[PDB]
Design a protein around this ligand. Sequence first.
Ligand SMILES: Cc1cn([C@H]2C[C@H](OP(=O)(O)O)[C@@H](COP(=O)(O)O)O2)c(=O)[nH]c1=O
Ligand SMILES: [Co+2]
Length: 136
Amino acid sequence: KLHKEPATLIKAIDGDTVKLMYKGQPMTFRLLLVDTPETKHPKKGVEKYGPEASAFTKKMVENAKKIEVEFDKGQRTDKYGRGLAYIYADGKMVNEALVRQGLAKVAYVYKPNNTHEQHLRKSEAQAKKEKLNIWS
Ligand SMILES: Cc1cn([C@H]2C[C@H](OP(=O)(O)O)[C@@H](COP(=O)(O)O)O2)c(=O)[nH]c1=O
Ligand SMILES: [Co+2]
């Protein structure tokens, strides 16, 4: 079934992308099922809440004493070679934490990499209802 594996932070990149050492390899990982507002990509600009989603992820992974990587059941890497996973910082899923704060939307739902979809949809509806950030 799904299993959590250890990883080590090298550097946070932005809201949904973090570089980690995973089984001795530096790899960058893209957070499954979420999309945060983009900081720097000229083809969208800096969207509202981009600095804030990036600050949230940075803080959460840099202060964690234990980072874990949990891959889903389909593809492990996307077309850019990034690892696709659920990242947990001290047992808390970062992908859910950003959606619960209204700093990410549930996006890019590619079957069968969707085991936590319902869990994430539940947090997003609670953040919309609370008119948090992206929803305010
Ligand atoms: C989250 C995710 C993104 N991607 C791809 C879709 C997008 O491709 P394109 O670049 O063609 O738009 C891109 C979005 O990533 P970012 O949101 O980091 O830009 O990464 C996947 O292929 N699978 C995934 O599960
Ligand atoms: Co994006």
